[PDB]
A paper describes a structure:
All family members function by signal transduction to the nucleus of cells via interaction with effectors (such as RAF, RALGDS, and PI3K) that catalyze phosphorylation of downstream proteins.
As a comparison with the KRAS169Q61H crystals, we also determined crystal structures of WT KRAS188, mutant KRAS188G12V, and KRAS188G12D (all isoform 4B) with a GTP analog (GppNHp), using crystallization conditions similar to those described previously for full-length KRAS188G12D.
Author numbering: 1 to 172
Amino acid sequence: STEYKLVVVGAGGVGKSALTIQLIQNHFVDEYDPTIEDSYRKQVVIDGETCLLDILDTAGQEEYSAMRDQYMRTGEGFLCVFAINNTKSFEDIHHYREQIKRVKDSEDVPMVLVGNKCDLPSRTVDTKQAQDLARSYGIPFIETSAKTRQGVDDAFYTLVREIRKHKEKMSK
Ligand SMILES: Nc1nc2c(ncn2[C@@H]2O[C@H](COP(=O)(O)OP(=O)(O)NP(=O)(O)O)[C@@H](O)[C@H]2O)c(=O)[nH]1
Ligand SMILES: [Mg+2]
Ligand SMILES: [Mg+2]
């Protein structure tokens, strides 16, 4: 049953761990417990295929460029998370994407842009700027809330679909 290695990247506090824990354990972690590196394995069926998701939940700011290069080299595709009330988190996406491209020596890497915390009224990142950026990069954009579970399964399942597409492309 095909294995997909998914890496959740983004600035600190955007809800990378909350999103992942909603997917794997079906509840919302209210506390902020900063991550070092966590990994999860999970069995799912997407489009009729049984997938083993190996998900790496990364740190917000890493104490080693080597740890970062390591997860960028391993990952088959990347959930690029920002929080809709954190402009710098959104701005950081470009920088994560650049480093991923450079680490893999490739211009086409499977990725989904995730605007988390869509439940908050405190928005500083507009859905159009995010849609524009994704459109530029040629990747899907999904708005999510780890608190309500809105879009959570959509985000990870879409990333799997992106990986499947990339493999089909790389062979053609
Ligand atoms: N309102 C709301 N809060 C959220 C959402 N997702 C995460 N949070 C909250 O934001 C805080 C940080 O979440 P967390 O998942 O730990 O962020 P992280 O991106 O994993 N942080 P780090 O990079 O340090 O590990 C927590 O208090 C959490 O409850 C969401 O969709 N909505
Ligand atoms: Mg975390
Ligand atoms: Mg980070």
